[PDB]
Amino acid sequence: GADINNYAGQIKSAIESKFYDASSYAGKTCTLRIKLAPDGMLLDIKPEGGDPALCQAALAAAKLAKIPKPPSQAVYEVFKNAPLDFKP
């Protein structure tokens, strides 16, 4: 519930829900660097590597994502700046 693995999954899920036809990329990975606010708002996102095809797509999708609020101070303090592997 509070757990960081749970929350990381929810951020991935929120991005994937706005990503048109994400399965066409099944198998590649993009590492994103994301910065969220304590309410979940995306503040900033940049690629770090893995498939560059997947990156611009994931990057576009994440901008539309409804990310839920981090469920705890510690999980907030991770995702206020942190890499996240998106793997559709």
For residue 87, give Cα distances in angstroms to 6, 8, 39, 57: 15, 12, 24, 12
Segments in 30-85 forming alpha helices (H): 52-62, 73-79
Integer Cα distance of 27 and 7 in angstroms: 22
Structure tokens at 1: 């519930």
Count of CB atoms situated within 10 Å of the CB of 6:
11
Beta strands per DSSP E along the chain: 30-36, 42-50, 82-86
Residue labelled with tokens 């066409």: 24
Question: What is the stated resolution of the deposited model, in angstroms?
Answer: 2.2
Integer Cα distance of 86 and 54 in angstroms: 9
On whether the CB atoms of residues 52 and 32 are closer than 8 A, the answer is: no
Q: In CATH terms, is domain 1-88 a member of 3.30.1150.10? A: yes
Structure tokens at 19: 């990503």
Amino acid identity, position 67: I
Which technique was used to obtain these atomic coordinates?
X-ray
**Backbone dihedral region for residue 32 (phi beyond 0: left; psi -120 to 50: alpha; all else: beta):** beta
Total residue count of the chain as it appears in this document: 88
Count of CB atoms situated within 10 Å of the CB of 24:
13
On whether the CB atoms of residues 48 and 32 are closer than 8 A, the answer is: yes
Structure tokens at 59: 């990057």
